[PDB]
Amino acid sequence: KLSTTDRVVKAVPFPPSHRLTAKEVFDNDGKPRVDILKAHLMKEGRLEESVALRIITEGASILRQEKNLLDIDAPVTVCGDIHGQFFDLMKLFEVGGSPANTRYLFLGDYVDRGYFSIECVLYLWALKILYPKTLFLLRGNHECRALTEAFTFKQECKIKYSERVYDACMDAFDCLPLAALMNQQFLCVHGGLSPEINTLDDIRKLDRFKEPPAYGPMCDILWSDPLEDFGNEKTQEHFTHNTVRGCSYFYSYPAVCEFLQHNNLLSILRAHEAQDAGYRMYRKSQTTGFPSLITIFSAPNYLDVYNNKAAVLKYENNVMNIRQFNCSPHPYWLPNFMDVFTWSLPFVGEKVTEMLVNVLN
Amino acid sequence: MDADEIKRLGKRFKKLDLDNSGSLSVEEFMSLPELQQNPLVQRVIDIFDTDGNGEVDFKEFIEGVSQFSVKGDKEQKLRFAFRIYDMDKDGYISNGELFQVLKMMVGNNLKDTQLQQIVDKTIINADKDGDGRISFEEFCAVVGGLDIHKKMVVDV
Amino acid sequence: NYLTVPADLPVITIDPAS
Ligand SMILES: [Ca+2]
Ligand SMILES: [Ca+2]
Ligand SMILES: [Ca+2]
Ligand SMILES: [Ca+2]
Ligand SMILES: [Fe+3]
Ligand SMILES: [Zn+2]
């Protein structure tokens, strides 16, 4: 009948086993060859450990020389959470345009939850090497050690590469800028505002080359959310304890609007919170007539269950163009990268034992 | 094995040998109603069926039940579990049969594409010597520390 | 009976999913 050696479902391509070398990932000038890298990672291809570390460290060196608060001019396509959904990241660049001719800004949460986080890091770091002054990456609350060891990035790295590659990602993440000032109008962060941050200068004075502390302004940038009832304030408090996160704070519509007014800003662009449409426009500020807060979320069908759209903000020609997209197929992993023997063997022992017991009564 | 255990096994064998042919066919196993809803029935029969004639004789039935003995060592229990996957009986779990044996157990709880993908990945992360297949050594290295041998004991 | 998986002002425009 069906072969016992040859693969049953031959329409599925067998993933490549060869690990790409330096010569194959970097061209004659040392520029990453992103087409090779994309094609190879789309097939679940892996790199040699030394090449992976080169991408991470060379990207880190570029990030290490950028400011806490980037100055990014328009036009630019702003993007929210990715959470290891590499194949939606492929779709994302289709929707927003190739980075060869498109300025990009990412607000963090590249890893965890999705099971292609290391591919997201490697490809985005390779783009950052190739386009150091037109593709920008900020830190999210997940680009740290506390979360990657609790969720799945650390395990993913140990499964596909090594803890050394993981450690290298952690040192690289410590270099990620925290915020961007976009076209002199928008503060861009992963999470939001801090009680201890009242000026743009307060972000500039921070020391970011560290694990995120458990409290403080750096924590707050990566962790804060708008109030559940943002804009319908019976609450009077500008900042209150964020009981969803267990740390940092909720910030209110008066809090956001005062910050915008003090610092001469149009809106706050952030991410950090899933949205059914991939974005949310919050109540306009009464002095700007413009949404005080914008959440952008770029991980469609989040966790393979939310069934949400994802979106990016293309800001260009004084138009804020929301571009939505749907999820794309992605190869399957068992939860926590479990192999099929570990998965099924307890069921084998169970059912052969059950059969034998029934055979014998 | 133990004498009295042999007497009892001869009686059950006869009860199951519906056409009194001296050998147990697949049909005769499937007559047991419990076995009807068990997806590994055919795999256990094939392992028991060492001479390959498609049925289980008494020698085969005794040798088969003995591997699940309390005195049996881990390597024996795991060697049995290994043969559940090793359809073609060649000592190595190959891609085609790993998929087939898993499809028997999962049924429709996974699509053929998702199962082929996680099967590919296991073949790849586990094949150390690089011959495209999973030996018993490679197999033990993955599942070894799971204490599955403890659940594979029958009182005859 | 079967194995289971472990359980001045800018305009704002929209391009819906393709
Ligand atoms: Ca018979
Ligand atoms: Ca036989
Ligand atoms: Ca085999
Ligand atoms: Ca092998
Ligand atoms: Fe997130
Ligand atoms: Zn977040």
Residue numbers in the entry:
A (entry chain A): 10 to 370
B (entry chain B): 15 to 170
C (entry chain C): 682 to 688, 713 to 723
What does the paper say about this structure?
The plasma membrane Na+/H+ exchanger 1 (NHE1, SLC9A1) is a central regulator of cellular pH and volume, and thus is important for cell proliferation, survival, and motility in mammalian tissues. NHE1 comprises a 12 transmembrane-helix domain that mediates Na+/H+ exchange and a C-terminal intracellular domain that is heavily phosphorylated and functions as a protein:protein interaction hub. We show that the two canonical CN-specific SLiMs, a previously identified PxIxIT motif and a newly discovered LxVP motif, contribute to NHE1 binding of CN.
We speculated that NHE1 P782 likely binds in the same hydrophobic pocket as that used by CN AID P484; namely, that created by CN H155 and Y159. CN and CNAA had identical melting temperatures, confirming the maintenance of overall structure. We also measured CN activity using p-nitrophenyl phosphate (pNPP; a small, general none-specific substrate for CN) assays. Both CN and CNAA had identical Km and kcat values, showing that catalysis is identical for both CN variants. We then determined the structure of the NHE1ctΔ92:CNAA complex (2.3 Å resolution). As expected, electron density was observed for CNAA and for NHE1 residues N682-A688 (LxVP motif) and D713-S723 (PxIxIT motif). Indeed, comparing the buried surface area of a modeled TPAP sequence for CN and CNAA showed the NHE1 P782 pocket to be ~36% larger in CN. We then measured the dephosphorylation rate of pT779 by CNAA, which decreased by ~50% compared to that with WT CN.
